Amino acid sequence: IRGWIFGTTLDSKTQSLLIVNNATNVVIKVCEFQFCNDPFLDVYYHKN
Amino acid sequence: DGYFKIYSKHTPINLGRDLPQGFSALEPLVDLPIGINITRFQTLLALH
Amino acid sequence: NKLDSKVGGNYNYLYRLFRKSNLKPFERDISTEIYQAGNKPCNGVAGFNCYFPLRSYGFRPTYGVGHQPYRVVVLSFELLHAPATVCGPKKSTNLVKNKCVNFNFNGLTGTGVLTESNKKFLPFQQFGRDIADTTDAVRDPQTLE
Amino acid sequence: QCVNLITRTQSYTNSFTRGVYYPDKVFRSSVLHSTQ
């Protein structure tokens, strides 16, 4: 469990707040995001 | 007033049950004025 | 007008005549959706007596005085309650203890003796208060004790 | 990549004494403080 979305409409019609955490430091941004009905994070071993 | 306030805590707990009877207050940790409406929210899961 | 007005006009200074209700304090709305100023559902880019936000001012230099551009800045701030980070060009003195002095800490002026406390302030706290609602302890802003 | 995946189910619980927080950034000790 790592972060949150907060907003009024979540579909880029108006601005909305995103909080994301990871292994160190957090990022916060307020934007006209078009979120996905399921916002989630993937972290995986990239061979390259 | 357009200001988004974040408070938090963590506490070790013995395996009676989560949300145990007892006490601990949340300290303020982050603050930021988004200057927008909020009506709804969700949370980011991290899949492996 | 000397730098924001133009003889062709400067119609990029948009303002909103219409909103479904009055917004609260320090809130800006930039959504471009049609407003139902007609009694029936105006949908899409147009409708009967219906609008987007209002057309900008004719910011033309000849318009006349009190009616041309006026650049405004409003400085909104709070003070005397919390760990400060922006202030006036006043010099710090050295700190003296166990003697009666007119102190000032981050603009908190007063008269008293300053002493080594035994108080565990949490990092977010600048001032400590009493039953009479007056400051009886303070965290020095140069060396954190 | 607009994937659906989250299967969320819920129950209900008593939050006995939890979620109290320091109401303002002023130090206070050995006192009972009434705050709204």
Ligand SMILES: *[C@@H]1O[C@H](CO)[C@@H](O[C@@H]2O[C@H](CO)[C@@H](O[C@H]3O[C@H](CO)[C@@H](O)[C@H](O)[C@@H]3O)[C@H](O)[C@H]2NC(C)=O)[C@H](O)[C@H]1NC(C)=O
């Ligand atoms: C947790 O996720 C953070 C992003 O959500 C991530 O922050 C990003 O870190 C990288 C590497 O420091 C930055 O990349 C930039 O680094 C320099 C800037 O001069 C350039 O050489 C690069 O081309 C690139 O621009 C990102 O800018 C930075 N993102 C933000 C929003 O600050 C953290 O590093 C992640 N933490 C861990 C432990 O992985």
Ligand SMILES: *[C@@H]1O[C@H](CO)[C@@H](O[C@@H]2O[C@H](CO)[C@@H](O[C@H]3O[C@H](CO)[C@@H](O)[C@H](O)[C@@H]3O)[C@H](O)[C@H]2NC(C)=O)[C@H](O)[C@H]1NC(C)=O
């Ligand atoms: C913050 O965002 C909220 C969601 O956009 C918004 O609430 C919405 O307000 C409008 C206007 O009151 C409602 O519109 C409906 O109002 C009544 C029914 O309640 C009808 O007469 C109208 O035809 C229309 O259907 C929205 O339904 C309402 N939505 C919710 C979830 O409450 C707030 O007004 C916004 N506040 C600010 C300051 O921007």
Ligand SMILES: *[C@@H]1O[C@H](CO)[C@@H](O)[C@H](O)[C@H]1NC(C)=O
């Ligand atoms: C005063 O400013 C200098 C330069 O930034 C800094 O090295 C010093 O630590 C400051 N004084 C105190 C008491 O921290």
